[PDB]
Design a protein around this ligand. Sequence first.
Ligand SMILES: C[C@H]1CC[C@H](NC(=O)Cn2ccnc2)CC1
Ligand SMILES: [Cl-]
Ligand SMILES: [Mg+2]
Lengths: 142, 128
Amino acid sequence: GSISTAVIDAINSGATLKDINAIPDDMMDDIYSYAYDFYNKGRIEEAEVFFRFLCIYDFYNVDYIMGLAAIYQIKEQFQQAADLYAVAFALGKNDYTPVFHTGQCQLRLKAPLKAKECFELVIQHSNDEKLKIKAQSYLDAI
Amino acid sequence: TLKDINAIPDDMMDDIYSYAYDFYNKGRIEEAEVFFRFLCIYDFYNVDYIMGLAAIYQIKEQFQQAADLYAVAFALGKNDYTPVFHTGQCQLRLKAPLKAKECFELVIQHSNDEKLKIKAQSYLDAIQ
Ligand SMILES: C[C@H]1CC[C@H](NC(=O)Cn2ccnc2)CC1
Ligand SMILES: [Cl-]
Ligand SMILES: [Mg+2]
C-alpha cells in the first residue's frame, strides 16, 4: 500500500517523480478534485485508485492521506485507515480530526484502551467543540 | 513482505538488528546503513527498523529523508513521540523553526516519556 511505497522510496533513495517535478501543482489539484468526484458519486474503487496515485506522487500530503484513510475506514479496513490517520495527524499536528477517527478504528480493532487515549487527547487538546462532543460520546460507551 | 512468509527466523532477525546497531554505535555508518536498509526491505512495517534507518539518514545529514521516515515510524507506532522529537531536530537543520517548534510542542502535549519531554523542552527554550 501507500505506506509500503513511501518506505521503499525512502530505502532506495533514488530520484522520485516528485524530485523531478513530473506533475505540476495545478494538475495534482485537478486529479484530487477528480478523486473526490468519484468518491461523491460512490465510485469508491476509482476514488481509491486516484488517491493511491496521488499518495504515490506526494505521500506527505495531509489531504491526500485523509482521502485514502476515509476510503479504508468505509471499507472496514480499520488497521490501514488507523495507520494513515496517524500519518495525517503527524504532518498536520493541529487538527484532531484524524485522532478522533483513529479512535473509531481502534475500537473496531478491539483495542479500547488505545481508542480511549485517542478520544481523551481530542477532549484535552482540540478546540473543535463539536468534535469534542463526538469524542465524549465514544468515551461514555467505553 | 519477506516477514509475512517468515523468510528468516525471528532470532536471526534480532541478531541482524543488534549487528546493525553495533555498526552504528562504532561509527561504521555505511555498514549500518546497509544493515538497516536490509531490515526495512525485510519488514517495512517494523517501527524499530524504520527508526534505525531514519537515524542513519539524520547522521548523514539527509534531514528531509530522515523526517519522512520518522513520520512513517510515528504513524505505525501510535505510542511513541521519539520520532516526532527527532523530526523537530531535522526541521531545525532544514531551517524551518516554526515546524520544529510544532514538533517539540506535540511531544510536550502528548508524550508520557518524561526524559523525552525534558529534551523537547530544552529545544523549545532555544528556539527564538
Ligand atoms: C493519530 C493518533 C495520535 C495519538 C496517539 N495516542 C497517543 O498519543 C497515546 N499515547 C501513548 C503513549 N503516550 C501517549 C494514537 C494515534
Ligand atoms: Cl518554518
Ligand atoms: Mg480546551
